[PDB]
Homo-oligomer: A and B are copies of this chain.
């Protein structure tokens, strides 16, 4: 009745996003039929990858393929216990969050060099996050990895709010880029807060069911809604984008 409850929280939190990612793919495909080949069609292709990765990720977690048990180190609020870890999330972020950055980058028309470095910083953020969840030898190391990951995040954040906005202004998309940048910054901040507050971190919240739902809700906005806003603006502003 707490295990019954913890398991109902887990499975529902995964099944919903398998549904919602699936539906988003369908809708994004239907939307792409009335978009002119070119720079709009490039932004659309990049955008469609986002839920395709997300549904893969969630099939990963549902099947157990990318879920494991981790013994928490001495000093942890749950020291000496095996904790459920959805390390599949941290893994697939490393492919899905660069799809987001590619869409934005194409939208804001950035320098490929800036693009390559941001995406590199982003893959570093994701991988050191996974290192943090997997590290079992000491509490010191888990949070050192957390902090390195934050440093990467900052690199990604800086480029958005400076260079990429600058590129957006002279590409004619500064306004829509600024709507999306805000969503992205606000919502991406949710993830390290969830990690820290949740069971892998401080464990102020000890239900993995709850933390899993927290990530799932964040995915809904950061991926599917983000992607839907992008596509609606692009289909309405095709000339403002092409060439």
Contact = CB atoms under 8 A, between A and B. Distances in A.
A46 interface: yes
Copies of this chain assembled into the complex: 3
B45 A124 contact: no
B65 A137 contact: yes
A176 to B, nearest CB: 17
A56 interface: yes
Interface string A98-113: 1100100010000111
Interface stretch (A74-82, A115-123, A189-197, A225-233): A115-123
8 contacts: A52-B124, A53-B124, A56-B124, A56-B127, A59-B148, A64-B137, A95-B123, A95-B124
Nearest to A62: B141
Nearest to A25: B151
A221 interface: no
A60 interface: yes
